[model samples]
Target: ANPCCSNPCQNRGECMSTGFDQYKCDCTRTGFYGENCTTPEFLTRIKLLLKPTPNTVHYILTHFKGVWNIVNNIPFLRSLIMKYVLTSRSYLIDSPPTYNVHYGYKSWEAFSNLSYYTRALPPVADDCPTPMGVKGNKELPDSKEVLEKVLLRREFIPDPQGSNMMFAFFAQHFTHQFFKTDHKRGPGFTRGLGHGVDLNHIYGETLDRQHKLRLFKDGKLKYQVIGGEVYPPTVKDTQVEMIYPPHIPENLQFAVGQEVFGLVPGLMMYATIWLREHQRVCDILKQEHPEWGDEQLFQTSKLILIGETIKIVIEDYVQHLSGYHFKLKFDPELLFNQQFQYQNRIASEFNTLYHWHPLLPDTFNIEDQEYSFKQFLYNNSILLEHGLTQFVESFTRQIAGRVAGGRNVPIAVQAVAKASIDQSREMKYQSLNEYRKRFSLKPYTSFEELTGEKEMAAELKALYSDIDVMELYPALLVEKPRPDAIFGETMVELGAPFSLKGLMGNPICSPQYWKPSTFGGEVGFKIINTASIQSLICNNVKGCPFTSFNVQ
Candidate 1:
């Protein structure tokens, strides 16, 4: 049941039916690009950004409170405050943190959708191992040994729920590292968050290590369970701070600088490249078919439609996820306006208890006379600037890709697919009766024969309800019936790159099927098993809006 009428696509693309009334054109190669398989430009461009380089540094930070033993030079008395502080504070209280799974990083579902493009799983090699009979069995120990090894480490307990919690918590804080603070919303919220950490924090200052310690000390942190005992934070009195090790090597700082410079430019380049490609495709189509109108072209091809769709999707996604988009707002200028107040407070409290600086002023501003702190800031401004830029660019790009790229879909099929699509849309907007009256629909009526009968308004209601009638209409509208790839469809659907199997767990495949002993029963059967193949097929095809489609 290939959708193509003449197998228009080249190579292994099997044309498949898009609708009873229309067929769709598909390509076999996820490798292929362009409308007619003329170019691999898209792939090359996207891959340029996605591919990893040796110079590429993934910046990550975790707060830990501890003092390195000067004698032993080992991290001792680590803090475990994060777990307790976060637990006591609030967890997704106002709004549940949102997660967008992308084509590469499919999150928990990654194992099910294995592919060459799949993201490398976080170093779960110890936890996720080859089975006993598998080839890599010898290289890896049994589950017990693996668990024991992980349990020995004083990290978060390894479990599905725990992993999810850690990921979400980290992601929330990660967003804060970039962009302006969302003070109006509350503490620990930001405007645009991304994936990686700022290099200065990760390497030079070792801020991440200190922050992890801070959380650990707060008792918000948990450790890997081992032998029925969990290791807790050892440091309590000491405060962790980022101190640059003396005799710091130049090469490391240079490496960090290079990455910082490249991060923003790299992301900007990616966005520009994609935008240019999209525009190029649209322009070429117009040039090739000058006679066709913009509306016609836009309404026809999937590739051309992607450009406009992306813009709309991005705008909508940001509106939903961003704290800036919400009711709360924070002005950094306002917060910093009262710098003198902080200076006075510091001066009043200084040297009495902590024996530290009494007043600290920003070096660049030079308002208050706390020379040492200001000097430190002045010297490291470059690092801060570079770190800020990387954080902003990386975070924005990651979040944007999650919300928009994850939902990437091609345009609906021309004419044939359009007919079904349009019908579904119209049904949502108005009913058949409403449509007929508005359009002045009328069938031949016999006025002379009306008097011969019982003189009643000799009109019988239209046979069958409109809903039932419409069910038969598709067959009438379409000349032929297309059968499923197989029977018993799941809710998930497979998209392009036909060589790939299984759907991405879309709402469609996991629909709530109502079952009853009589009629219109409850959704008794919880959709679980049913092979990934079936799930894809079930979701692949479009259906009635209210009854079939998943809104969110």
Candidate 2:
């Protein structure tokens, strides 16, 4: 009898004969772990409760989340209840020593935290069938050339999820806070001064830069009146240190919190919004606490802004990523008295995931005027010319390209994709399937199964013969996004834990710290609780234009 002919392995695993009656079931492609291929992904319990399923759940959970909102404000009961809920959900947060292999935690550097990053997975790159670098694998095509071809997005392919430019712009704005790459340290180490999500992008990561942008009067950030609107102060020569292309004129460049903030219109658009928001909040704080000096007001307002930013992320940004079925929570008590450490070290794997260059279209259409990609970079004039409202409206209304679905990467941005691929090689990240398994995502067996693009199918197979060994960077770029979602399945799954853990473990997530006294009392606490991206834009950008993560 041919034992393999019966196909005993589950989930379409490949069953091969080892002997007369013995067989081996290869589970590499099945995305399942068991010998019989019964288990699926990682953290099955979490996925069972969370991941979108049953279809009717949207109707149920939305109302429950709506209900959860009202009573969670009662303080005492909410704290106790949420503490229990969070303790149960605490499994979602990665325990300390996230990078056990990288650092044995046996030395002074362990507690001192000499390394800027932690790993979501072990240094398991050695498990790949191919060499460390994908390019070294003779079985795989030259990824440098193949990736350029694979990512050759000739035209801006609109996202099937209906996400707009605002979504992409906000992604850049939010990620830049913690995704600070120290080029001198190479792509592997971070320049991040802190371990968690603070609004370093707007307030400046370093102290010197922070002093350069502060007004030191009434907690207001340095700003200049331009075109009858408030904008970040203008810089000439090395006054505040901004990263701008030589082409941009001095008058056009604005001093900002982050050095790299001036490089693109999208970054500047967000910088402008935050600059205004800072000044606006400072005014509110001044009114509430007239006795407070410059230092108290500044620190309090900065803390408030960070809270507002994180709230928007969970409620709006991640909510959109998670789809409508599950209203991703911004519950302050969700991590109350949980096992998570006070600080969260950003992961190198997380750094690699957000290189979503394919989200940028070739041109930005702002107020019926089109600016090509070249013109858009290092051009703050476009941001200044139209100011915040029109600029935000422009982004919200325009459609962003899908994340590299055979859509053309602008010729200018192609080098970024190449650099990222090379960096991934140097970092020696694990293979795509290995990363998938690490993140509890279903793995792909074949190129066609991964891409779901009939056109990309043959090319991907030719490039990387085995799906298991396909490199992570290119695989992420080409992998098909699920229905009504902006990112690929594995892509979102890999990032979710890092982000959730980081946000939940943030210093402000503490029950004691979340109190009104920590946030400058009830007024400031209320501001954070009430904050949303919609509210931020409406309050800061005059006339209150409609806003969303997806196109209206």
Who wins the lDDT comparison? 2
Q: Residues 234-257, candidate 2, lDDT per residue (tens digit)?
A: 777227887877877788788877
Off-target runs (Cα >4 Å) in candidate 1 are 5-381, 384-552
Note the residue pairs that clash in candidate 2.
Answer: 42-440, 152-408, 153-407, 153-408, 153-409, 154-408
The local lDDT score (0 to 100) that residue 150 gets in candidate 2 is 82
Please identify model 2 stretches exceeding 4 Å from their true place. 1-93, 100-115, 124-140, 404-408
For the record, the alpha-carbon RMSD of candidate 1 to the native fold, in angstroms, is 33.5
What lDDT is reached at residue 270 by model 1?
A: 23
Model 1, position 495, has a per-residue lDDT of: 10
Model 2 CA RMSD to the hidden true structure, in angstroms: 7.2
lDDT of 2: 0.72
- Residues 1-552, candidate 1: write the lDDT tens digits: 212322233322333346853544355443454544435556656865575421121110111113212212321211122122122222211111111113211244433322111211111112222211111222322223211221112221112111111112122222222322234542222322221122122111244443443222111221222223222122122222322333433311212111222122222222222222223333444554567554333322222222122222222221122211121111112222121111000000000111101011112121222223224321332323333223222222221001010111112112222333232322221122222221222211221121122211121112111221121111111111012101000000101111001111111111131122111112111111111211211222122111100112
- Residue-level error in angstroms, candidate 1, position 546: 46
lDDT of 1: 0.22
* TM-score per candidate, chains pooled: 0.15, 0.82
